[PDB]
Design a protein around this nucleic acid. Structure first.
Ligand SMILES: [Mg+2]
Ligand SMILES: [Mg+2]
Ligand SMILES: [Mg+2]
Ligand SMILES: [Mg+2]
Ligand SMILES: [Mg+2]
Ligand SMILES: [Mg+2]
Ligand SMILES: [Mg+2]
Ligand SMILES: [Mg+2]
Ligand SMILES: [Mg+2]
Ligand SMILES: [Mg+2]
Ligand SMILES: [Mg+2]
Ligand SMILES: [Mg+2]
Ligand SMILES: [Mg+2]
Ligand SMILES: [Mg+2]
Ligand SMILES: [Mg+2]
Ligand SMILES: [Mg+2]
Ligand SMILES: [Mg+2]
Ligand SMILES: [Mg+2]
Ligand SMILES: [Mg+2]
Ligand SMILES: [Mg+2]
Ligand SMILES: [Mg+2]
Ligand SMILES: [Mg+2]
Ligand SMILES: [Mg+2]
Ligand SMILES: [Mg+2]
Ligand SMILES: [Mg+2]
Ligand SMILES: [Mg+2]
Ligand SMILES: [Mg+2]
Ligand SMILES: [Mg+2]
Ligand SMILES: [Mg+2]
Ligand SMILES: [Mg+2]
Ligand SMILES: [Mg+2]
Ligand SMILES: [Mg+2]
Ligand SMILES: [Mg+2]
Ligand SMILES: [Mg+2]
Ligand SMILES: [Mg+2]
Ligand SMILES: [Mg+2]
Ligand SMILES: [Mg+2]
Ligand SMILES: [Mg+2]
Ligand SMILES: [Mg+2]
Ligand SMILES: [Mg+2]
Ligand SMILES: [Mg+2]
Ligand SMILES: [Mg+2]
Ligand SMILES: [Mg+2]
Ligand SMILES: [Mg+2]
Ligand SMILES: [Mg+2]
Ligand SMILES: [Mg+2]
Ligand SMILES: [Mg+2]
Lengths: 93, 121, 91, 82
RNA sequence: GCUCGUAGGUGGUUUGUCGCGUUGUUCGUGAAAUCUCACGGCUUAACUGUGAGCGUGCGGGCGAUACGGGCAGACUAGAGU
RNA sequence: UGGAGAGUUUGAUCCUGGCUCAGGACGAACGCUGGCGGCGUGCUUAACACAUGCAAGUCGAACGGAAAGGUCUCUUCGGAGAUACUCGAGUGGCGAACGGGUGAGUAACACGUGGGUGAUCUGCCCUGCACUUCGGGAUAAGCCUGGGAAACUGGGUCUAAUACCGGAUAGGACCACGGGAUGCAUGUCUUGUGGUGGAAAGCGCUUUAGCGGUGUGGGAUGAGCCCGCGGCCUAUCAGCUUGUUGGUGGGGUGACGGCCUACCAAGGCGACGACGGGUAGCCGGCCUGAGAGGGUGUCCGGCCACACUGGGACUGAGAUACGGCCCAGACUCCUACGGGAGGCAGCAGUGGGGAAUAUUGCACAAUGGGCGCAAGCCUGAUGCAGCGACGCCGCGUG
């Protein structure tokens, strides 16, 4: 190459996706979303359900109690925020 | 310094404060200056230390608030009264001296304390 | 810098060496980046094994072998192939 | 130990880097006070002077190119928004 | 001691959808030694080298809805009126 | 591919149900006995304190100078001469952040595992695109003095540099405006326009002896940062938090971020156990068990944390910076009393504790690492040797 090589193609990374309900929204552009998952017990073998809590960034804070949201995880946007809003699906009844 | 006076201990025996019981050097001697020997009791000590509270000890005065004359007409005066606990042979029971000491210890023959002291004035 | 070095993993009186590519700032008998051969200095002449293409890739990417790995590369001819020298085999 | 030479070279480096950093700081504060003064005339050339000093320091290696870029962008936006 | 009931666990019949659990394949990863099969060398073994298993898992793509599950419905047997 | 039971309650019986035993294992100790060889292992307690010797130096093919070597050199007949190989010391470059040690602290993204880095840095290595162009000032060393018991230090000259500074030109520095592709939202990758700018160095050569440096594209390598899952006991620990949670504007970082700052909201964590107490290096691994499981983290390997205790900065690509620096505390030592020096959880060894665990040995012969154009130098890493029946295997005492 008689000049600078631009780059070589690479496959961009794929980020995780989760869906959960909005629990708390009074956060001034942030929302709190409850996520649940199931993991098999290491010893007894039963299937159990555990609920978590993540903080999601909301550039325009429009979300109420319920308001199912699919979240995709980002860079550390804040001290305790690692998720951003993707879209609103199955709005609160 | 007289009886019932309290002094700060200037060594590492573990005692903090002692109370003068008797000024040695004669019957009915009143005041103890720098270089004078004191019978005293330990009114406070570091917990779990070598010396305990209430032990009757013998000490030498090394600092006085009251100014003391010197043969050349000069005076020396400290900001606190301090003493050093000694053995019967005039050696300190501790291993080091804290703060300066007066030069009268030289003429009172307290060479070990004089050597151990950080400064002699 | 990336180096190709011999790693010894034998017993006290059987000094078997493995031709491996490892980082310079590592111990001798450590976790190398990738092992690309071995060398047993206990046969009659010796036992020399070189992959000869991963070594070529590492040489083209910047890996620099030491004196014994260099001698083994010259013996196996892979160094000559990489450098364009005529004789590609001198075993 | 043969590290007294290293200590001497170290202290020489402290003096050199400290001097250049303090000069850069003084230039930055001069540009800042010009920015709040809002002359908008000599600040235009003070911006260029500060950029030259800061990327000269970056080339000298006393700082990093990332820090030089950050400070140059900050001073440029500082001149811009007024 | 008995009862009620919060969370929780668990749940009737049937239809459709998803395919999360479930399961299959494929790819990447799961360092080496050490554990095992098979060999090779120290007179043999201990010791050591090589090939394959191990690494019970995880991430990605591609197949299934038989069961659990999410959603959308329906029925009366459960339950209630 | 792998599952043993026996004893013991009663006048005699069957259950339930404890207690004990037969087996294996160890970084082992004790008692007695004791030949050798192959291979391994050996302060588990006091992260208690240390006498002593060695553990990081190298380059004259960067530079000024010549203390020594042989030296041609004047010749003293024991003194001269850097100009010469060579080189004490000195400037400069690199290394020194690797290697070696301990498991104290740590219940933590420390460790194992799998992702993200459109949030990143990256010397020496490879390699694409170009340059390698001009001036200046002092100083080390040396010399003359001065201070101090030393440790150390001042004043006056004096000589360089691949040391320093100032320059011309150079786009992955920035700003504004755009084009072209992409989605994963901030964005991501590449050109253009106008305004800004940013470095280099010379040295050697038995004449193809060779080295270099930077301006940047792209690889290789190392690392910084975030996330999910898993690996102790305790509720006789039930309410925890205020830079705490978020947002905004700045500052800071290689990089996102209350990391810091000014203002606004009242929020964030908790019965799926926060907060608190006890204990502990994690894992691959090791032992036992048919297995599931129970115990454990020692050889070795990967990582983490620490270097007398506690705290902090700088150099540098890169610092818990063991054999670097500053300060506070304790300890030890020298002193002329004014002041100074020191840290074996490196190798070897000493004191003390314990039932108890080893030489102040050899060599860079091989491998790895560092310095040159090298020849070469260093390496208590390493390769061995020495002591112990300490463990496995094997052979004899016919
Ligand atoms: Mg923000
Ligand atoms: Mg100033
Ligand atoms: Mg910035
Ligand atoms: Mg009842
Ligand atoms: Mg009852
Ligand atoms: Mg009762
Ligand atoms: Mg209920
Ligand atoms: Mg229910
Ligand atoms: Mg059902
Ligand atoms: Mg249900
Ligand atoms: Mg055999
Ligand atoms: Mg394996
Ligand atoms: Mg899959
Ligand atoms: Mg009914
Ligand atoms: Mg029984
Ligand atoms: Mg009976
Ligand atoms: Mg009975
Ligand atoms: Mg029964
Ligand atoms: Mg040097
Ligand atoms: Mg020299
Ligand atoms: Mg060099
Ligand atoms: Mg360095
Ligand atoms: Mg180190
Ligand atoms: Mg220990
Ligand atoms: Mg520990
Ligand atoms: Mg993890
Ligand atoms: Mg001078
Ligand atoms: Mg320019
Ligand atoms: Mg220059
Ligand atoms: Mg605040
Ligand atoms: Mg802010
Ligand atoms: Mg611990
Ligand atoms: Mg069993
Ligand atoms: Mg510490
Ligand atoms: Mg110690
Ligand atoms: Mg410390
Ligand atoms: Mg460096
Ligand atoms: Mg730096
Ligand atoms: Mg420190
Ligand atoms: Mg060091
Ligand atoms: Mg040390
Ligand atoms: Mg040792
Ligand atoms: Mg004992
Ligand atoms: Mg003992
Ligand atoms: Mg060597
Ligand atoms: Mg070698
Ligand atoms: Mg024995």
């Amino acid at each position: 190459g008689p000049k600078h090589t631009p780059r070589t193609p690479k496959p961009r990374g794929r980020r995780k996706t989760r869906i959960g309900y909005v629990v708390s929204d009074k956060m001034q552009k942030t929302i709190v979303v409850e996520l649940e998952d199931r993991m098999r017990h290491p010893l007894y073998g039963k299937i159990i359900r555990t609920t978590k809590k993540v903080k999601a960034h909301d550039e325009d804070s429009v979300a109420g109690i319920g308001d199912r949201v699919s979240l995709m995880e980002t860079r550390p946007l804040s001290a305790t925020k690692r998720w951003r809003l993707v879209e609103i699906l199955e709005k609160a009844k | 310094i007289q009886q019932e006076s309290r002094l700060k201990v200037a060594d590492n025996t573990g005692a903090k404060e002692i109370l003068c019981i008797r000024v040695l050097g004669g019957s009915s001697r009143r005041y103890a200056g720098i270089g004078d020997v004191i019978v005293a009791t330990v009114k406070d000590a570091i917990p779990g230390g070598n010396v305990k509270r209430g032990d009757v000890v013998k000490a030498v005065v090394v600092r006085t608030v009251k100014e003391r004359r010197r043969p050349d007409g000069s005076y020396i005066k400290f900001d606190e009264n301090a003493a050093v606990i000694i053995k019967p042979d005039n050696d300190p029971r501790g291993t080091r001296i804290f703060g300066p000491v007066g030069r009268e210890l030289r003429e009172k023959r307290f060479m070990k304390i004089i050597s151990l002291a950080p400064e002699v004035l | 810098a990336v180096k190709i070095k011999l790693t010894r993993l034998g017993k006290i009186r059987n000094p078997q060496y493995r031709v491996a590519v490892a980082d310079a700032r590592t111990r001798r008998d450590g976790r190398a980046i990738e092992v690309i051969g071995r060398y047993h200095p206990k046969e009659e002449p010796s036992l020399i094994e070189i992959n000869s293409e991963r070594a070529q890739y590492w040489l083209s990417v910047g890996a620099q072998p030491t004196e014994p790995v260099l001698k083994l590369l010259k013996i196996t001819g892979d160094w000559q192939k990489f450098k364009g020298l005529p004789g590609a085999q001198g075993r | 130990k043969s590290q007294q030479k290293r200590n001497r070279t170290n202290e020489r480096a402290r003096l050199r880097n400290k001097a250049v950093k303090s000069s850069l700081r003084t230039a930055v504060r001069a540009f800042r006070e010009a920015a709040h003064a809002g002359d908008k005339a000599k600040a235009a050339e003070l911006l260029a002077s500060t950029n030259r000093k800061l990327d000269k320091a970056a080339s000298k290696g006393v700082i990093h190119k990332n820090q030089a870029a950050n400070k140059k962008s900050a001073l440029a936006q500082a001149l811009n928004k007024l």
